[PDB]
Amino acid sequence: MKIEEGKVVIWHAMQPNELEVFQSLAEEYMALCPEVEIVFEQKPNLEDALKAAIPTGQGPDLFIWAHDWIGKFAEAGLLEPIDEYVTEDLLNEFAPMAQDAMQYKGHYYALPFAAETVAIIYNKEMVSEPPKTFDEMKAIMEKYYDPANEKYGIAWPINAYFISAIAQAFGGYYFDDKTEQPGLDKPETIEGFKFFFTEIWPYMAPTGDYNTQQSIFLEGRAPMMVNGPWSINDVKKAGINFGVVPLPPIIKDGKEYWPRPYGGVKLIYFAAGIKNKDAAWKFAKWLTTSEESIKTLALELGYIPVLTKVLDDPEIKNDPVIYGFGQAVQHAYLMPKSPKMSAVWGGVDGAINEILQDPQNADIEGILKKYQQEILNNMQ
Numbered sequence: 001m002k003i004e005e006g007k008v009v010i011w012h013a014m015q016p017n018e019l020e021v022f023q024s025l026a027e028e029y030m031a032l033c034p035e036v037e038i039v040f041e042q043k044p045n046l047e048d049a050l051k052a053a054i055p056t057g058q059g060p061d062l063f064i065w066a067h068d069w070i071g072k073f074a075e076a077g078l079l080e081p082i083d084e085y086v087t088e089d090l091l092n093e094f095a096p097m098a099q100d101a102m103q104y105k106g107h108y109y110a111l112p113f114a115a116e117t118v119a120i121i122y123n124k125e126m127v128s129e130p131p132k133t134f135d136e137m138k139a140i141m142e143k144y145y146d147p148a149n150e151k152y153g154i155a156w157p158i159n160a161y162f163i164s165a166i167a168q169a170f171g172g173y174y175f176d177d178k179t180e181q182p183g184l185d186k187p188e189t190i191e192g193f194k195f196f197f198t199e200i201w202p203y204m205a206p207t208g209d210y211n212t213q214q215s216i217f218l219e220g221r222a223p224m225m226v227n228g229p230w231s232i233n234d235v236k237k238a239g240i241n242f243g244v245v246p247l248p249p250i251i252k253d254g255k256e257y258w259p260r261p262y263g264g265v266k267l268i269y270f271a272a273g274i275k276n277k278d279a280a281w282k283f284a285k286w287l288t289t290s291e292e293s294i295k296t297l298a299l300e301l302g303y304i305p306v307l308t309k310v311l312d313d314p315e316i317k318n319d320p321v322i323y324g325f326g327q328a329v330q331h332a333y334l335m336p337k338s339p340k341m342s343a344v345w346g347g348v349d350g351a352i353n354e355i356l357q358d359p360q361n362a363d364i365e366g367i368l369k370k371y372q373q374e375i376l377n378n379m380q
């Protein structure tokens with residue numbers, strides 16, 4: 001007879017300030033179970049690192065990411081099924097979309113701990129009323145834009161997911177998960193991309209890089225940032241008094257066109273080749289179904305609980321940041337689990353790379369047509 005012993009190794013791509021929150025939870029857990037070491041290990045290119053290490057027996061026990069990898073990782077045999085651990089009682093602890101995010105074709109491979117998307121994070125010392133329409137957003141942008149003094153109207157990391165809200169504001173889509181077809185060359189999608197680079201890019205420092213954009217906001221050199229819960233401890237460490245609201249509707253002849261960001265469910269995944277399964281299960285189950293664990297992720301970072309019970313906690317119900325991300329998620333599209341999405345993301349990031357070579361003059365329509373076809377050829 002025995003106990004669970006040893007180590008649980010968890011790979012991730014969190015930056016240090018987000019990680020701190022997760023490490024303090026690990027430390028609590030290790031206080032609860034002194035015979036179990038929880039070890040977090042940062043990977044620059046986590047998806048690449050897992051693909052390479054998992055099959056060779058060099059991968060971790062667990063890893064953290066949004067849910068959309070679960071389809072392609074399972075098809076590649078890179079995950080460990082946990083069907084034997086999942087029960088209806090456990091499933092019923094989670095919101096249905098978290099219930100669905102944690103499985104692929106009938107097998108469970110993870111536990112869910114949050115919902116997320118990007119939203120406007122605004123600095124209350126620079127913006128006293130956040131924008132409820134794109135027009136008010138643009139006026140705030142105009143008010144603060146002053147590149148000569150290294151001041152910009154907004155901070156916004158640029159990549160497929162980060163600008164999907166705007167790309168998809170006018171009925172466009174990267175991918176229709178009904179028909180399972182990319183939508184890059186739909187006029188409404190083209191309209192959304194042009195809108196980003198015509199209406200919003202001119203107010204930015206002209207770089208798509210994540211930490212450069214974020215640092216502009218953290219340094220008070222932009223009044224607003226488009227980012228997710230994963231960035232919130234960075235905002236807090238910078239001493240900024242902030243709020244969170246959804247990207248507001250663009251108005252066209254009195255009509256609203258709501259930006260529609262992609263969003264997702266955060267999962268702790270079980271990796272194929274896992275060495276310490278029962279210990280890793282116990283930690284994950286704790287992390288995802290203990291009230292104080294989930295309350296801590298939500299109150300510290302703005303993560304929206306998918307642990308139903310805590311949604312009724314007054315601590316959670318009266319919290320501004322979780323409410324604002326929650327409002328943003330209401331307009332979000334849940335990322336598909338289809339492995340087809342892999343080439344979609346590649347196609348959209350490829351188009352953005354070419355647009356960024358010459359954003360003011362690029363032929364966005366023809367680029368998008370070009371990448372639609374590449375996606376159509378690489379989709380599987």
Ligand SMILES: OC[C@H]1O[C@H](O[C@H]2[C@H](O)[C@@H](O)[C@@H](O[C@H]3[C@H](O)[C@@H](O)[C@H](O)O[C@@H]3CO)O[C@@H]2CO)[C@H](O)[C@@H](O)[C@@H]1O
Nearest residue numbers: 013014015018066068069159160161162210230264345
């Ligand atoms: O752009 C294509 C990718 O879009 C999706 O990735 C999203 C994540 O889903 C989302 O969580 C967010 O990731 C951040 C992560 O949460 C945080 O812990 C880490 O420290 O930083 C990440 C951002 O740099 O944003 C990315 C988009 O960058 C999708 O999940 C992924 O498969 C696509 O490749």
